[PDB]
From TrEMBL, chains A, B:
<feature type="domain" description="Non-reducing end beta-L-arabinofuranosidase-like GH127 catalytic">
    <location>
        <begin position="2"/>
        <end position="412"/>
    </location>
</feature>
<feature type="domain" description="Non-reducing end beta-L-arabinofuranosidase-like GH127 middle">
    <location>
        <begin position="423"/>
        <end position="519"/>
    </location>
</feature>
<feature type="domain" description="Non-reducing end beta-L-arabinofuranosidase-like GH127 C-terminal">
    <location>
        <begin position="521"/>
        <end position="633"/>
    </location>
</feature>
<dbReference type="GO" id="GO:0005975">
    <property type="term" value="P:carbohydrate metabolic process"/>
</dbReference>
<dbReference type="InterPro" id="IPR012878">
    <property type="entry name" value="Beta-AFase-like_GH127_cat"/>
</dbReference>
<dbReference type="InterPro" id="IPR008928">
    <property type="entry name" value="6-hairpin_glycosidase_sf"/>
</dbReference>
<dbReference type="Pfam" id="PF07944">
    <property type="entry name" value="Beta-AFase-like_GH127_cat"/>
</dbReference>
<dbReference type="Pfam" id="PF20736">
    <property type="entry name" value="Glyco_hydro127M"/>
</dbReference>
<dbReference type="Pfam" id="PF20737">
    <property type="entry name" value="Glyco_hydro127C"/>
</dbReference>
<feature type="disulfide bond">
    <location>
        <begin position="322"/>
        <end position="399"/>
    </location>
</feature>
<dbReference type="InterPro" id="IPR049174">
    <property type="entry name" value="Beta-AFase-like"/>
</dbReference>
<dbReference type="InterPro" id="IPR049046">
    <property type="entry name" value="Beta-AFase-like_GH127_middle"/>
</dbReference>
<protein>
    <recommendedName>
        <fullName>Glycoside hydrolase family 127 protein</fullName>
    </recommendedName>
</protein>
<dbReference type="InterPro" id="IPR049049">
    <property type="entry name" value="Beta-AFase-like_GH127_C"/>
</dbReference>
Length: 635, 635
């Protein structure tokens, strides 16, 4: 399976990651950006390798920043070799190899700052989290370059971790306050075939939330008495009860979704039905009760967390970039657990909305928080101070960048899934794939202007003719999908199972499948239990959720009312925001001129008509500070 | 001027304060309530008088709780002598006299806990605030009983304070972090004629906010380096700039309104036009941009503070009971500065909505915070944790009670104002007053079922016939007010000036003025800049703002839509909530069904008709926990 991107939309983002984002982060990691908060991330490994002097600096999880940058670089190298970039990575890798302790432990903070204090604060100090991120980078770097050095280093650490943690004699019955090692270990298993890694992942998941609480035991041993800052206590870490008894998403959103992603991978690999069902129950809870229309998750700044069903406020949303990325990871494992278009529908929602919303179109600035409603003046409220009205650079928790980079750079890995049963098309993205079906070589090409248009042309070319199944997602946002094969209509209705059309036939060289997904402008309504959206409507076209910005429509977007009957139109604007479809129509505003400086009046408001224009949510805040809303008042 | 209450509405509240609220607090102040947080408020004075041993206990402003209870008791004694209650007060008073230092200083914390450390932390430790509250209680107790002892004690302290603070040689150019002393000093001046008190008040106000900052000077002297916890710094205390440059309300709402109250009193008494204009500018800002329809003020829990113009969220409101009480105090001084009905309109709005909303109808439980929208489950959000979904008892900052008690108990003082050129009727409350106009003895009787009905009968009986002016407020909520004198209709339009009808004529014994204020059900709309209320409407009848509760309408009050043409009806329910007018009609809900557990859908919502019933805002949460909204979605 090699996949080449051949589109406009994602190719532009990859180019931005390659030329702007990854190089800038490299400078930051090496403290060569004069105005920046220093990182010391590379320096810490130098000191640890005994090649430099100085004090540890930065956050306890600083090592993971280096990991994430390496992981993204790995993916970049799969789609364009660059010997200089590869050399930078190789040198960092050898440095990691020299900072690594003889027993396999690799952690700058506990090598330089608190030697000998390792494994005494898993609740807070992210040791396994950093190890997990480094494992992911090493796996990725191996798959991209064939070079095993980083993989070898990380297997030594993974083996050491296996000796330290478990239910055995002299082992710690522990796990990390921030999940990540569990999903990373699955990847390491997939590339090595070493079953210890699969079992260790299972151990960490099965042990979480067991009584007596591991976190209480280590806390006691540190002599710590203070109550945990987060009111829900261990719900923050989803360590309140065992994972199979968790029926609602709670706590910190990234933590949760990384945990779920591991649970879904383990359910698939182990055939564990109880875990599969837990995943499905959690999936339904997150995606049908605690998810924003943008694919954002996390409704409370305090703990960057889930709250509860249907509590999805737009102005105080957290919807962290990293959580939406984590949702994408989760969906991919859910798809391996069960082929249901609803998983890919979510993946696509996050991909085209609440992930990429996290960056400026040119990749120079980022959001941590992705709100669905902005009144900039109000961002001075204490309960809105997490909401930044414009994107910026970050430091300390500068994850928005190497985090988005690793997803965007690997976008090719999410388009297709080769199974022995079928070749599945999840995303409609100009691309090609060279794969093997029933031991035979098959080339598949997608040509499409998606997401701006719903027409997709798939050319299927097997090396020699042969029978196999092509599984095509029918997007849940779409009504009335149509399919033709070599110009002849095919009734897909009997071929559809759980949002995928299964097309099984003998394929010949140059066979052509045409897909047509109508993209009308839709008015989306939220379930009536979503109190924040009572009387409000969102615009969506294809997979893209739209928003209104002040720059196009004036201030006071709360005072814009979209009548039900207003006739909406869409058209392409090549020179706007890198080339986007915009949506236009006629709305109504209440007349303030008719107001008289009173605050409250018993009068019937007078309304006048205004043109409006809406643009894609992901593209907001590229034309200066201003109001923005997704959910607009109706009628 | 003697005023007797003869109504049902306020009389019931006064009885509750007299029989439940004041006696319960007396027990709490003496630590005789088993399952309460101890107060030690009386005990601290015992220790300070050398009549008991032990450590200081409680908040630095604990002394003010005793003061507020005494002040209320004073007002209770004006409307019904009670030798036992008077005895309790007299004993407390003699105790205060024995706790007082030889120089006049009276403060338990700086007598027992930090002897000699007085006046070193005016920013935080409330010394002048407690002195102020004690002064108010003494003034009130003198007016009520003729007993001067408490007054004599407090004059000694006030004189001492006058030697300590000022611009003179050896004086501290300081002022309290919590305003109060300034308005208290005006009251002491009014009852003693001692001009020092008036000038001292003027000094505290003129000094506030002058550079170099007093609070920085004392902070430095304490060796304190920590930044102030509130992000706006000295805006919290309204000490950021001089008062006559403050054009917006900012900071902590009670602090601000106590300051404004002093400013308005001084502008009147000193004839200071610059201060008058400053008060007017602030008045307009508060009441036309930063006030809730309930008379609540304070839109941010953090700092219990004002935010900025038109930021009035209903679900995260703070609208502290004490701030609404403070607004009432402010309006009374504004009325002395300028006879404008808009002042009394706000006074009335607070009195019948966001003050008495602070207690259960039987006076046993209280709110600190008065929200305008409640979803109880959501009160677990960190950004809503200040919102309690049911009333309770309080401890430490148990001000809601002795604070409401003092206002309710003194409600008679707010009904009329005698000036040398007119008798003004501000509030429509069954009552009578014996007063002197142009040296002539005049008796006036009001009979009315206000607020449930807008008909008022005033009987005017001068000792002998004579020409004078009666000023009658024409409520700003009203349209088509009518006035009839001895059965003949009078054209009031030419008699009205700034919301008061000036009726000047020769009055004879038994003259009858009938006022009729129509009370239709009104749909109130907020200025379009109020984002929170875009697309919403509030119901109001007479001075009373209405709300919907779950107990009458079912859950999910966000999913209730009030059509503009729905017919509304009002009628009296004698056995509901101590006897209230309710409002009824037909609203619409969106039908849950068409979602089928989806979260977001492109479907046209189906709506069905439901009955609704609205009750007075003040009377919400007397029938158990449940949803409540004031601002209802419109269709």
């Amino acid at each position: 399976t090699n996949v080449n991107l051949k589109d406009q939309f994602w190719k532009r983002y990859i180019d931005v990651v390659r030329h702007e984002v990854i190089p800038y982060q490299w400078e930051a990691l090496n403290d060569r950006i004069p105005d920046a908060e220093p990182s010391h991330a590379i320096e810490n490994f130098r000191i640890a390798a005994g090649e430099s002097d100085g004090e540890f600096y930065g956050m306890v999880f600083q090592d993971s920043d280096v990991a994430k940058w390496l992981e993204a670089v790995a993916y970049l190298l799969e789609t364009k070799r660059d010997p200089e970039l590869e050399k930078l990575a190789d040198d960092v890798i050898e440095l990691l190899g020299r900072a690594q302790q003889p027993d396999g432990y690799l952690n700058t903070y506990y090598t330089i700052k608190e030697p000998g204090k390792r494994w005494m604060n898993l609740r807070d100090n992210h040791e396994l989290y950093c190890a997990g991120h480094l494992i992911e980078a090493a796996v990725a770097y191996f798959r991209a370059t064939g070079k095993r050095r980083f993989l070898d280093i990380m297997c030594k650490y993974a083996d050491y971790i296996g000796t330290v943690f478990g239910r055995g004699e002299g082992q710690i019955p522990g796990y990390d306050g921030h999940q990540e090692i569990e999903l990373a270990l699955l990847k390491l298993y997939e590339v090595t075939g070493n079953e210890n890694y699969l079992k260790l992942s299972q151990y960490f998941i099965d042990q979480r939330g067991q009584q007596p609480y591991y976190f209480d035991q280590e806390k006691e041993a540190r002599g710590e008495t203070e109550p945990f800052w987060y009111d829900g206590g261990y719900r923050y870490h989803q360590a309140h009860i065992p994972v199979r008894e968790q029926k609602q998403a709670v706590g910190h959103a990234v933590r949760a979704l990384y945990m779920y992603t591991a649970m879904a991978g383990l359910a698939a690999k182990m055939g564990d039905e109880s875990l599969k069902q837990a995943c499905q129950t959690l999936w339904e809870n997150v995606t049908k009760r605690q998810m924003y229309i943008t694919g954002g998750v996390g409704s409370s700044a305090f703990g960057e967390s889930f709250t509860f069903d249907f509590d999805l406020p737009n102005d105080t949303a957290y919807a962290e970039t990293c959580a939406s990325i984590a949702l994408v990871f989760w969906t991919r494992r859910m798809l391996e657990l069960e082929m249901d278009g609803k998983y890919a529908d979510v993946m696509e929602r996050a991909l085209y909305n609440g992930t990429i919303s996290g960056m400026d179109l040119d990749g120079k600035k980022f959001f941590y928080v992705n709100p669905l409603e902005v009144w900039p003046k109000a961002c001075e409220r204490h309960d809105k101070r997490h909401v930044k009205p414009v994107r910026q650079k970050w430091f300390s928790c500068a994850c928005c960048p190497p985090n988005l980079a690793r997803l965007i750079a690997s976008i090719g890995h999410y388009i297709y899934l080769q199974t022995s049963d079928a070749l599945f098309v999840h995303l409609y993205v100009g691309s090609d794939i060279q794969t093997e079906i029933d031991g035979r070589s098959v080339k598949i090409m997608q040509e499409t202007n998606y997401p701006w248009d719903g027409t997709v042309r798939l050319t299927v070319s097997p090396e020699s003719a042969g029978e196999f199944t092509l599984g095509l997602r029918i997007p849940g946002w779409c009504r009335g999908a149509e399919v033709t094969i070599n110009g002849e209509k095919v009734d897909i209705v009997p071929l559809i199972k759980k949002g995928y059309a299964y097309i099984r036939r003998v394929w010949q060289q140059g066979d052509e499948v045409k897909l047509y997904f109508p993209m009308p402008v839709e008015r989306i309504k939220a379930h009536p239990q979503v109190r924040a959206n009572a009387g409000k409507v969102a615009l969506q076209r294809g997979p893209i959720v739209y928003c209104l910005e002040e720059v196009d429509n004036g201030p006071n977007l709360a005072n814009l009312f979209l009548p039900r009957d207003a006739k909406l139109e869409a058209h392409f604007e090549p020179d706007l925001l890198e080339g986007v479809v915009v949506i236009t129509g006629i709305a109504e505003r209440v007349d303030e001129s008719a107001w008289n400086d009173e605050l409250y009046r018993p009068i019937e408001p007078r309304t006048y008509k205004v043109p409006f224009r809406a643009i894609p949510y992901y593209a907001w805040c590229n034309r200066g500070e201003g109001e923005m809303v997704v959910w607009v008042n109706e009628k």
